[PDB]
PDB file of C-alpha atoms and ligand atoms in Angstrom:
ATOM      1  CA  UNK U   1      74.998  94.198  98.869  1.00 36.93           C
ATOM      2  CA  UNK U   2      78.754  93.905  97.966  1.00 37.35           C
ATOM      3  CA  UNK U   3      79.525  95.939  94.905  1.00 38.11           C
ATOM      4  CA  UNK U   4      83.084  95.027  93.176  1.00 37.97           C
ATOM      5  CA  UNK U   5      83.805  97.396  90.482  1.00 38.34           C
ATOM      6  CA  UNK U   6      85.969  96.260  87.087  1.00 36.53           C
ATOM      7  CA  UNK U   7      88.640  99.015  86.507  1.00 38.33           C
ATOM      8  CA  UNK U   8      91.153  98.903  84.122  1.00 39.25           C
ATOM      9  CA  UNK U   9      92.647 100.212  80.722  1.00 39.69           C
ATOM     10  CA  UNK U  10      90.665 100.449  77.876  1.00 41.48           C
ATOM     11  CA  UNK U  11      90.792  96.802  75.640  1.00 41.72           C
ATOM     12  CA  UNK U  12      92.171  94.920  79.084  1.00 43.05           C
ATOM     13  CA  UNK U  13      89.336  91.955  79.180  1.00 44.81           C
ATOM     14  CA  UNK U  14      87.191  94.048  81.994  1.00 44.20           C
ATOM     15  CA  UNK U  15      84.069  92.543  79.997  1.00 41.27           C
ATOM     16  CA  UNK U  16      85.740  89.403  79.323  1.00 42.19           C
ATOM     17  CA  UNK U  17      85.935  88.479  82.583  1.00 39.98           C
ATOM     18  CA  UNK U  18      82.470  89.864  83.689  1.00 38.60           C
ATOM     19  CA  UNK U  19      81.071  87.677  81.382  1.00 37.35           C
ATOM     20  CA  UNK U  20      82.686  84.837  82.737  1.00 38.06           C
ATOM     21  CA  UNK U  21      82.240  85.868  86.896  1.00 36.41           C
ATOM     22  CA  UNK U  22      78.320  86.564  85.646  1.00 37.07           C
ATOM     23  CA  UNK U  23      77.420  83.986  83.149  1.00 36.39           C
ATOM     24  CA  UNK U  24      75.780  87.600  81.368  1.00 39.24           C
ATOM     25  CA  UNK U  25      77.037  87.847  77.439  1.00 36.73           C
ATOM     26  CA  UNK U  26      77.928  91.656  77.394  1.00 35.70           C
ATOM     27  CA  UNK U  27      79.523  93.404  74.416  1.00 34.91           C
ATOM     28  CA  UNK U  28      83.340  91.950  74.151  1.00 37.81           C
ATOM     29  CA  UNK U  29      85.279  92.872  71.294  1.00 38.37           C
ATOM     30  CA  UNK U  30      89.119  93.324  70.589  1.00 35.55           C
ATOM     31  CA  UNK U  31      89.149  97.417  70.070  1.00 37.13           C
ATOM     32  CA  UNK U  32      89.262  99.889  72.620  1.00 36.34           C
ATOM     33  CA  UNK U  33      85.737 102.014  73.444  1.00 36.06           C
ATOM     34  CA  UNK U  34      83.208  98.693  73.118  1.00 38.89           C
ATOM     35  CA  UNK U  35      81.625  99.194  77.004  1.00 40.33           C
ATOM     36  CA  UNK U  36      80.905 102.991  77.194  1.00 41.44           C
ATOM     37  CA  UNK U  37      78.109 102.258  80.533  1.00 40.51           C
ATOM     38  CA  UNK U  38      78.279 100.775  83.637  1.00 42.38           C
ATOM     39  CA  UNK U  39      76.451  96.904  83.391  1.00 42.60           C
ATOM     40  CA  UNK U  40      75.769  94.943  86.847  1.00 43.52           C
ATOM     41  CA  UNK U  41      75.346  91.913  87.586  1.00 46.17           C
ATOM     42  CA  UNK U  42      75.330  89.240  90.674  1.00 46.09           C
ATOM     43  CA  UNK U  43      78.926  86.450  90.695  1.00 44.89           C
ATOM     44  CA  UNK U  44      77.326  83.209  89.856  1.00 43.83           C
ATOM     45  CA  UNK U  45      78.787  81.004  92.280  1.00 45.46           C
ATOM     46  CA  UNK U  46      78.273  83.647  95.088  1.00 46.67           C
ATOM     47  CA  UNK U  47      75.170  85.361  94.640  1.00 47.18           C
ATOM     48  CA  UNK U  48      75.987  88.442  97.041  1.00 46.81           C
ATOM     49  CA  UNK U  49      78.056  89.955  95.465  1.00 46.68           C
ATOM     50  CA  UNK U  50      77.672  92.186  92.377  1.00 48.45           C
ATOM     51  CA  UNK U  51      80.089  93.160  90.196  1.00 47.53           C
ATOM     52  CA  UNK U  52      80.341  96.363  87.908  1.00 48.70           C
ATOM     53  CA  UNK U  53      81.554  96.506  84.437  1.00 50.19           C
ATOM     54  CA  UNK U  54      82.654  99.908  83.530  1.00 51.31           C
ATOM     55  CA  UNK U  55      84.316 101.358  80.434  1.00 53.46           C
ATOM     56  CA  UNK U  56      87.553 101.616  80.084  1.00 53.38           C
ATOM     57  CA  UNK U  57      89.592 104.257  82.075  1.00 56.53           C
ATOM     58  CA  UNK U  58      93.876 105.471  81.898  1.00 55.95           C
ATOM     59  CA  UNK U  59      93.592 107.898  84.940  1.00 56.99           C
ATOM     60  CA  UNK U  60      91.138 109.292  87.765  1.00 58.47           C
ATOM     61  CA  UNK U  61      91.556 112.647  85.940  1.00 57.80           C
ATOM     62  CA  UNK U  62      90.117 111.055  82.921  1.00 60.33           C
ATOM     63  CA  UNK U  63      90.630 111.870  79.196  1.00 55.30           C
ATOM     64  CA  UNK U  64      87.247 111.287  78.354  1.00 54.51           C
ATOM     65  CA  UNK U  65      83.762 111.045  79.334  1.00 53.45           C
ATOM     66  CA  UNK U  66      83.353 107.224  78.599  1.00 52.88           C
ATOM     67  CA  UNK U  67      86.321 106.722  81.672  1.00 54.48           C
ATOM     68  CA  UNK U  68      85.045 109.553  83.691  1.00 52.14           C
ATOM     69  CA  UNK U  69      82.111 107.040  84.246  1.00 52.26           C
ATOM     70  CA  UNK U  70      84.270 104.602  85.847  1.00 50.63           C
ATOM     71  CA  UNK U  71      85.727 107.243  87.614  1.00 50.19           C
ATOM     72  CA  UNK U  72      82.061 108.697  88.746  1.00 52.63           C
ATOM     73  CA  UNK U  73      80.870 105.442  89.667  1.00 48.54           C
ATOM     74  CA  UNK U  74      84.183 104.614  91.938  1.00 49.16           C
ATOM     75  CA  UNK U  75      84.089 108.742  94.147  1.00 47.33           C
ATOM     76  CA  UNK U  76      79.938 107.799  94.822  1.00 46.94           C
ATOM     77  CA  UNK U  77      81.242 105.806  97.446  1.00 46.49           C
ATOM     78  CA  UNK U  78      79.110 102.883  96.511  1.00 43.63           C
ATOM     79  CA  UNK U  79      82.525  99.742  95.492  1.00 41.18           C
ATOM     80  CA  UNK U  80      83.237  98.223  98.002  1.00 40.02           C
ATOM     81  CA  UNK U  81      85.907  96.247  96.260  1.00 42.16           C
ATOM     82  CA  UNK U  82      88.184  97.762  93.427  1.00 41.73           C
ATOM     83  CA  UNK U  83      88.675  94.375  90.574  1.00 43.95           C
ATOM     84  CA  UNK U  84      91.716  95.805  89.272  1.00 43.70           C
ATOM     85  CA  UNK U  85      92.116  94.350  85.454  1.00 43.53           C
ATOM     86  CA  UNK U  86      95.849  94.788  84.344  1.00 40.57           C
ATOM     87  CA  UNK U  87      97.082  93.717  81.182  1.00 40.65           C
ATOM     88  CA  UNK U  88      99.944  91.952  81.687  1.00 40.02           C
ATOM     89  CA  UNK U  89     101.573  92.836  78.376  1.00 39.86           C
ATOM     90  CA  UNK U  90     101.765  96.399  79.457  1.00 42.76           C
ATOM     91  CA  UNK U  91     102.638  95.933  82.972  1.00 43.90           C
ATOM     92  CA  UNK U  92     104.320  99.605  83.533  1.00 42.71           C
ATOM     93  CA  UNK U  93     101.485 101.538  81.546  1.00 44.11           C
ATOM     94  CA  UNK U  94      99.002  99.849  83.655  1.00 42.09           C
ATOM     95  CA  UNK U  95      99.847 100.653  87.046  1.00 39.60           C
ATOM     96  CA  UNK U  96      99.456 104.207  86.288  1.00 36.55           C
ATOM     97  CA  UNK U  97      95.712 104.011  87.043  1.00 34.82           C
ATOM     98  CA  UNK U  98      96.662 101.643  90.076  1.00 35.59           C
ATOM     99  CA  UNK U  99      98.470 103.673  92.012  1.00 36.59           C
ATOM    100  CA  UNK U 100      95.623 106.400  92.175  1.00 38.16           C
ATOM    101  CA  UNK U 101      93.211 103.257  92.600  1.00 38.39           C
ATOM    102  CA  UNK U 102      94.842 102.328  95.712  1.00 35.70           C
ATOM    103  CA  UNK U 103      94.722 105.655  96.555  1.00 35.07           C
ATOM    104  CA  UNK U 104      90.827 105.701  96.574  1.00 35.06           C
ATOM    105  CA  UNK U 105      90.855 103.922  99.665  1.00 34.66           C
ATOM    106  CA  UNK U 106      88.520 101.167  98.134  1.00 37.09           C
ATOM    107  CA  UNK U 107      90.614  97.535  98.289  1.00 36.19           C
ATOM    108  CA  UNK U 108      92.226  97.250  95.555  1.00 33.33           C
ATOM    109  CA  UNK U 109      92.668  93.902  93.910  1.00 29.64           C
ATOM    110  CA  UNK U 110      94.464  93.372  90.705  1.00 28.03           C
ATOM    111  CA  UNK U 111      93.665  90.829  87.740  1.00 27.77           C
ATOM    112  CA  UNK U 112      96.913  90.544  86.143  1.00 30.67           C
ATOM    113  CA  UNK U 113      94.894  89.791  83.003  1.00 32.14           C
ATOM    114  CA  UNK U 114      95.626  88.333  79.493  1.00 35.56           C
ATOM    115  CA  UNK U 115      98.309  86.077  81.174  1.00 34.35           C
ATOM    116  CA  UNK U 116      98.177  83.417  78.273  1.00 33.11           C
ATOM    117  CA  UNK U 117      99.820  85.800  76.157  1.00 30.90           C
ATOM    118  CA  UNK U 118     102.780  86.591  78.188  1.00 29.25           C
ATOM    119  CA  UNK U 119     103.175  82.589  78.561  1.00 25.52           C
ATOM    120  CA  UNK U 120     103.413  82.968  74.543  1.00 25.62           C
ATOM    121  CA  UNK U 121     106.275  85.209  74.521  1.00 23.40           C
ATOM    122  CA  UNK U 122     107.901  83.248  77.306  1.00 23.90           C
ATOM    123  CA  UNK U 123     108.176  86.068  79.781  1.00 28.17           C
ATOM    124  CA  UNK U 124     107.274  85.522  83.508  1.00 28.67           C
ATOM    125  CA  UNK U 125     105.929  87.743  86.041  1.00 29.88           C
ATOM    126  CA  UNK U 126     106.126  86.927  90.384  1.00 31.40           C
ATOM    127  CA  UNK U 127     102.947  87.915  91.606  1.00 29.74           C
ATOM    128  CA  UNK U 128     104.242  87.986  95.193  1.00 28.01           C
ATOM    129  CA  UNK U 129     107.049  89.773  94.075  1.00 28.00           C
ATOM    130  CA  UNK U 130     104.395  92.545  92.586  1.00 25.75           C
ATOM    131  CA  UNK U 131     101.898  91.946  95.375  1.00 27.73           C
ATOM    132  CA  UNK U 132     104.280  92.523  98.329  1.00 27.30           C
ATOM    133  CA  UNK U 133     105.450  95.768  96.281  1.00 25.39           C
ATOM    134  CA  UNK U 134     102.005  97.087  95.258  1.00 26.83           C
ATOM    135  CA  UNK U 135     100.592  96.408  98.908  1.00 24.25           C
ATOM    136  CA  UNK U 136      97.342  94.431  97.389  1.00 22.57           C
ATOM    137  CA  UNK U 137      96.475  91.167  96.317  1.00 25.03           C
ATOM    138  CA  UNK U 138      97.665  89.935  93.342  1.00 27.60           C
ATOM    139  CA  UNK U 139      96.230  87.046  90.923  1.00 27.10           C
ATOM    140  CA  UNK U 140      97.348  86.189  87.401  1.00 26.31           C
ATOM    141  CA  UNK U 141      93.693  85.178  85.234  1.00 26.05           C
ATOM    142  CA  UNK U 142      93.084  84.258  81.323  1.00 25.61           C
ATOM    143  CA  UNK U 143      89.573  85.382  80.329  1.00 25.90           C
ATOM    144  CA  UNK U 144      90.616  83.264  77.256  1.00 27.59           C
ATOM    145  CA  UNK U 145      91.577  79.756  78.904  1.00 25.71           C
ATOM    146  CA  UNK U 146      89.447  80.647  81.860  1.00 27.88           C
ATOM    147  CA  UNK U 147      91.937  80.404  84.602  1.00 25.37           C
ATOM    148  CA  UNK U 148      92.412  82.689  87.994  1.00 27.05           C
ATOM    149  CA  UNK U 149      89.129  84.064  87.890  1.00 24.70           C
ATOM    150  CA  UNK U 150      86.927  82.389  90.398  1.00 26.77           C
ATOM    151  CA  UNK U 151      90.417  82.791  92.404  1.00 24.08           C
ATOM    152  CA  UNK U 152      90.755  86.673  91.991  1.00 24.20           C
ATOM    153  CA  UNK U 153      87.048  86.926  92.523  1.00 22.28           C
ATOM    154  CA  UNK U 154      86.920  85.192  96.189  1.00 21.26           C
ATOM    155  CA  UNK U 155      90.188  87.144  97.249  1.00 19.23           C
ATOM    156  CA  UNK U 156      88.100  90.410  96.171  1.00 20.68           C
ATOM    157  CA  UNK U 157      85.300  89.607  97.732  1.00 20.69           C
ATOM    158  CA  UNK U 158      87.821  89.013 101.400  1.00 21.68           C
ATOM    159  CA  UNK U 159      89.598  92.589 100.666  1.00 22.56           C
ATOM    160  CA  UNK U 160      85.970  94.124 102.110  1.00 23.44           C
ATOM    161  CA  UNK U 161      85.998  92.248 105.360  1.00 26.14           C
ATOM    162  CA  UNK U 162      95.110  99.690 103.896  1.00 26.38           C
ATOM    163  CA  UNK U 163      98.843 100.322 102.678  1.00 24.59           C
ATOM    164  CA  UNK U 164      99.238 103.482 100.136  1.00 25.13           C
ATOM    165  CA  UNK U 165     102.284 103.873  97.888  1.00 26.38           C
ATOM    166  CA  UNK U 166     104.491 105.931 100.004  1.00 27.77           C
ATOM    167  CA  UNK U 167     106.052 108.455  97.607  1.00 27.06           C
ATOM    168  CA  UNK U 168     108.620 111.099  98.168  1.00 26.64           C
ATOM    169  CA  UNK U 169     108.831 112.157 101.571  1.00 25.53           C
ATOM    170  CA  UNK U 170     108.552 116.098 100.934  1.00 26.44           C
ATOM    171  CA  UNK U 171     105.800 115.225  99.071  1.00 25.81           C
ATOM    172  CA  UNK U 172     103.904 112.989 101.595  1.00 24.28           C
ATOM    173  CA  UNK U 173     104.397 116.143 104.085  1.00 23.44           C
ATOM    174  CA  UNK U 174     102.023 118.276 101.736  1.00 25.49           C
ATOM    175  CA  UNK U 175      99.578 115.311 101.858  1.00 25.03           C
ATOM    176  CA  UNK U 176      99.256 115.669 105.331  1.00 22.96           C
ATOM    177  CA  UNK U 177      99.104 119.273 105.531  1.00 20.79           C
ATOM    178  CA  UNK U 178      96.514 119.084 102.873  1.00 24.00           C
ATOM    179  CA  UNK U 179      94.283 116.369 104.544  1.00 24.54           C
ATOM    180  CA  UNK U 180      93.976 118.249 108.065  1.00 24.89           C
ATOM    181  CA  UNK U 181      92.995 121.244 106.052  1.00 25.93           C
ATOM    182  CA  UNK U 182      90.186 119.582 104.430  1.00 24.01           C
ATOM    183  CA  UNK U 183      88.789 118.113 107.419  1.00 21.77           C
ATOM    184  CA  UNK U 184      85.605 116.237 107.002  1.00 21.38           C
ATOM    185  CA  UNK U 185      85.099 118.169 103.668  1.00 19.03           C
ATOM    186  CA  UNK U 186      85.434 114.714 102.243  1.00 20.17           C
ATOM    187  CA  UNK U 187      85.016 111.269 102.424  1.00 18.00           C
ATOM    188  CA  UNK U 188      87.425 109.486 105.313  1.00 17.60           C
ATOM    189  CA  UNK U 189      87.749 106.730 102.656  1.00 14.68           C
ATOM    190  CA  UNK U 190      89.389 108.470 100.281  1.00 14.89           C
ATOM    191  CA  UNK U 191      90.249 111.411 101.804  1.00 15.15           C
ATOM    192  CA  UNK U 192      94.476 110.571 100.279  1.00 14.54           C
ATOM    193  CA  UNK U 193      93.015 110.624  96.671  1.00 13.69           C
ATOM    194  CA  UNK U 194      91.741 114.309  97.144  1.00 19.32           C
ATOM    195  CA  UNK U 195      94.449 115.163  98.958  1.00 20.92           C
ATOM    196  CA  UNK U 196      96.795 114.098  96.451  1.00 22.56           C
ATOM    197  CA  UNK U 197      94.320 115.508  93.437  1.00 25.04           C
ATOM    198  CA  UNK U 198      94.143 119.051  95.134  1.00 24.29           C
ATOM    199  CA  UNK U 199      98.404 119.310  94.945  1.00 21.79           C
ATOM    200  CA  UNK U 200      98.395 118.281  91.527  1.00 22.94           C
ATOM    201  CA  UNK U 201      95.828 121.487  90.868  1.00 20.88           C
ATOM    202  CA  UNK U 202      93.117 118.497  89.418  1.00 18.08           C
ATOM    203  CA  UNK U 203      90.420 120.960  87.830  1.00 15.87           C
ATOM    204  CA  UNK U 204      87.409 117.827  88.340  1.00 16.40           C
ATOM    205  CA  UNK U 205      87.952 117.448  92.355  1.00 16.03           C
ATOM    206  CA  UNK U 206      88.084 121.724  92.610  1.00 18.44           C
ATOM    207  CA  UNK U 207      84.816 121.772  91.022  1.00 19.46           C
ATOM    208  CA  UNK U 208      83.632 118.735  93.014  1.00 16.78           C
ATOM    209  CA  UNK U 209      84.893 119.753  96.329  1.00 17.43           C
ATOM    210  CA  UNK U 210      83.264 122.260  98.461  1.00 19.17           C
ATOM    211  CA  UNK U 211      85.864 123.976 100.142  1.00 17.98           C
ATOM    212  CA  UNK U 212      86.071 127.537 101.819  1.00 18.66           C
ATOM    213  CA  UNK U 213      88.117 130.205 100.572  1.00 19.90           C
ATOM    214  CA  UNK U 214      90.260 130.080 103.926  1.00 18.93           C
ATOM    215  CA  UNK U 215      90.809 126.030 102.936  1.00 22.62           C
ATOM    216  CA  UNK U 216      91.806 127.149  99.624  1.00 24.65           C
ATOM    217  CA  UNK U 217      94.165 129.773 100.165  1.00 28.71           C
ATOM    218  CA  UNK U 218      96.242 127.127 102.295  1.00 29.44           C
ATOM    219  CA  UNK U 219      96.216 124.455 100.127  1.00 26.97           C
ATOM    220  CA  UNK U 220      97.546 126.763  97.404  1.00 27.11           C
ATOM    221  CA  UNK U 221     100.404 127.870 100.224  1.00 26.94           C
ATOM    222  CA  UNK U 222     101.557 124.461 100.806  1.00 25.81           C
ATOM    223  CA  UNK U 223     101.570 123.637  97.068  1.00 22.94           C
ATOM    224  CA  UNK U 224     103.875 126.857  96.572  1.00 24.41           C
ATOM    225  CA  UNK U 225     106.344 125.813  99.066  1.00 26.28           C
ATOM    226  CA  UNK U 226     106.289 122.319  98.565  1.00 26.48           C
ATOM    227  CA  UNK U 227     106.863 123.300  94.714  1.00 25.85           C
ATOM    228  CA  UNK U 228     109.908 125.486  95.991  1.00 26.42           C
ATOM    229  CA  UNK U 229     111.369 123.090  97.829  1.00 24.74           C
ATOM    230  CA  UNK U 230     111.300 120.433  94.834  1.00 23.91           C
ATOM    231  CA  UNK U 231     112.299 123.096  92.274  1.00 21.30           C
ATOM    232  CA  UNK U 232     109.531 121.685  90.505  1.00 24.36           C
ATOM    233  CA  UNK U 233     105.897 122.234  89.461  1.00 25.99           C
ATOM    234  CA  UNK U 234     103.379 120.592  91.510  1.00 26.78           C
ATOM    235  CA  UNK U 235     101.355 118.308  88.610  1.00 22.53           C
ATOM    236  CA  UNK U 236     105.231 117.538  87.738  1.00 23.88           C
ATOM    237  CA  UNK U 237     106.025 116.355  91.397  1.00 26.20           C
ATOM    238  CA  UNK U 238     103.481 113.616  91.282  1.00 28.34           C
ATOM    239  CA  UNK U 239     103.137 112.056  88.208  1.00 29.92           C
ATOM    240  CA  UNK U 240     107.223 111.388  88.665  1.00 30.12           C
ATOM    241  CA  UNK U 241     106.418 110.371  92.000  1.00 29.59           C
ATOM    242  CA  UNK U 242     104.072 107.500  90.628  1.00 29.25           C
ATOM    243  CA  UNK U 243     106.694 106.536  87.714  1.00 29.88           C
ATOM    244  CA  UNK U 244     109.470 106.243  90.327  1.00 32.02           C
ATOM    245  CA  UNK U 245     107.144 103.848  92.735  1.00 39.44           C
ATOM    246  CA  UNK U 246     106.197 102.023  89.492  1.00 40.87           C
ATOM    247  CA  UNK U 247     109.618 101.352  88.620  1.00 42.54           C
ATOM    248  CA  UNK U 248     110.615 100.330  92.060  1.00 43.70           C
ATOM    249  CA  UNK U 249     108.068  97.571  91.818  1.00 41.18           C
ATOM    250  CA  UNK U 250     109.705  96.196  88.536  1.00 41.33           C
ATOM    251  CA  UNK U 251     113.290  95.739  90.330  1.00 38.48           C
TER     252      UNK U 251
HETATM  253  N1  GDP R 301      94.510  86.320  74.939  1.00 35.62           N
HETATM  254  C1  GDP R 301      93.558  86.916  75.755  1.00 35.62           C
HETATM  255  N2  GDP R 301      92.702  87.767  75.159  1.00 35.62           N
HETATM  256  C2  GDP R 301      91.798  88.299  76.074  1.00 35.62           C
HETATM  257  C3  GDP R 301      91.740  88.021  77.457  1.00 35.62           C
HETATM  258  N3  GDP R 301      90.706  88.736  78.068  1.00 35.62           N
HETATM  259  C4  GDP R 301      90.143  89.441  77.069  1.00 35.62           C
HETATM  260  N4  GDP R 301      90.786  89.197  75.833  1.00 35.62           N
HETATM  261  C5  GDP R 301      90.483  89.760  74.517  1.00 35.62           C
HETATM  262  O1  GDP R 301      90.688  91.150  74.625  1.00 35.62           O
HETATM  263  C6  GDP R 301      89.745  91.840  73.799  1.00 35.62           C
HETATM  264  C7  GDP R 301      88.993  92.925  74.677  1.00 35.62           C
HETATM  265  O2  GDP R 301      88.281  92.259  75.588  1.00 35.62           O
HETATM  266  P1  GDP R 301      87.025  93.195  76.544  1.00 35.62           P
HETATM  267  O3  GDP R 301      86.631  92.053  77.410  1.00 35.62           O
HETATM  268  O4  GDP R 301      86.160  93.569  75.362  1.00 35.62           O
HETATM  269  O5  GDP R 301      87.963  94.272  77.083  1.00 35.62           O
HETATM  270  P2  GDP R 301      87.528  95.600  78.064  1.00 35.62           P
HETATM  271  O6  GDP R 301      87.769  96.612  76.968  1.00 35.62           O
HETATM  272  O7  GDP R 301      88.514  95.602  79.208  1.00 35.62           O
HETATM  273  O8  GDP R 301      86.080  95.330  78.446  1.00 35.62           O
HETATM  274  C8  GDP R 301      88.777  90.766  73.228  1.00 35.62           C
HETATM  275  O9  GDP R 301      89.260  90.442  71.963  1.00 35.62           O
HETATM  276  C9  GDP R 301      88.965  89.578  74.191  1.00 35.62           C
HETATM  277  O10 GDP R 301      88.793  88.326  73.612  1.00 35.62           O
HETATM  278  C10 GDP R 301      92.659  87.118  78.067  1.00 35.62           C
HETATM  279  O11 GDP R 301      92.773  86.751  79.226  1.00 35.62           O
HETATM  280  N5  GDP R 301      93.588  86.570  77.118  1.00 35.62           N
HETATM  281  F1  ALF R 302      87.865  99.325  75.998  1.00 34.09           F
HETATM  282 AL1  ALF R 302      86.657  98.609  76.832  1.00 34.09          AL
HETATM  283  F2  ALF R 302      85.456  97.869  77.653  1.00 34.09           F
HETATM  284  F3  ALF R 302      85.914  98.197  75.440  1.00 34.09           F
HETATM  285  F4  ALF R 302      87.367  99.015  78.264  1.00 34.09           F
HETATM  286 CL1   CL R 303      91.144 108.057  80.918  1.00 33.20          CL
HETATM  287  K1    K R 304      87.314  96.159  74.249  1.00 36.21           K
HETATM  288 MG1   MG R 305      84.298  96.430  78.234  1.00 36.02          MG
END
């Protein structure tokens, strides 16, 4: 059965809209924190798929244990499409978590969500623009006036029948040195996101990952000269990495 997973900020309309795609009347309220478990259920005009409402969630090395859900529920391998919810009143802030969604490996599409009020403040937003710069499908949807959603479902559900953000290219050397030494040691999938999470010294994917100590003491020489040749510390390299990619979309 196809599984598409709701990810987004906290307080984005990830309920909202599952509410809507299910006909289901799950908790919806204007605060973040309201979902805090994962709730299935099958899309009402296409009754294979099943879509996932998950809390909340700012990054894939989450700040709490409500988001690490989402985060749980997206490394067990079981999405086969990513429903990325994006508030469209924090555009930049948003794409944080996308850029590591992408880098999952699960297709990524993106509800540019609460659209209606943008239209209030009179401010636009291209979605080809943004889509041909993210790399995904991109489709503007008001849980409120109930628009885009049966579109960004159906274009979901044809992302599972994949271009990464390319960052800095002494940093996507590292990746690669880091993926052949981890092998099959994890998923094929989303073998980039634990590439990526291993430079940045992620604590969650070291405990997670199984690696030898001969794997180890590698990774930890090619994030020493990669950090060297940057003049910068490795957690530091990527996060301005993803800022910098985010910002080139928005030009
Ligand atoms: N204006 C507007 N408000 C929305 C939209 N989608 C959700 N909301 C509101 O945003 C708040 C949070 O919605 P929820 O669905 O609970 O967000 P989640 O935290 O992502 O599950 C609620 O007050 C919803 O009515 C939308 O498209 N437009
Ligand atoms: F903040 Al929520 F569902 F309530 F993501
Ligand atoms: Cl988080
Ligand atoms: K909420
Ligand atoms: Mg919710």
């Amino acid at each position: 059965m196809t599984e598409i997973a709701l990810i987004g900020n906290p307080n984005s309309g990830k309920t909202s809209l599952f509410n809507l795609i299910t006909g289901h009347n799950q908790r919806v309220g204007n605060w973040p924190g309201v979902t805090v478990e994962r709730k299935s259920g099958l899309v009402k005009k296409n009754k294979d798929l099943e879509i996932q409402d998950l809390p909340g969630i700012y990054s894939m090395s989450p700040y709490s244990p409500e988001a690490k859900v989402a985060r749980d529920y997206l490394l067990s391998q079981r999405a086969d499409s990513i429903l990325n919810v994006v508030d469209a009143t924090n555009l930049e802030r948003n794409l944080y978590l996308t850029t590591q969604l992408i880098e999952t490996g699960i297709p990524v599409t993106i509800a540019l969500n609460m659209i209606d009020v943008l239209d209030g403040q009179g401010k636009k937003i291209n979605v080809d623009k943004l889509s041909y710069h993210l790399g995904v499908p991109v489709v503007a949807t008001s849980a409120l006036k109930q628009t885009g959603v049966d579109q960004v479902v159906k274009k979901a559900a044809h992302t599972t029948t994949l271009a990464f953000p390319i960052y800095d290219d002494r940093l996507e050397a590292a990746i690669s040195q880091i993926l052949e030494v981890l092998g099959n040691s994890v998923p094929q999938r989303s073998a980039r996101f634990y590439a990526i999470k291993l430079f940045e010294q992620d604590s969650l994917v070291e405990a997670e990952l199984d690696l030898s100590q001969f794997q180890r003491k590698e990774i930890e020489d090619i994030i020493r000269i990669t950090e060297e040749i940057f003049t910068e510390d490795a957690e530091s390299i990527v996060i301005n990495e993803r800022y910098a990619f985010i910002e080139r979309v928005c030009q």
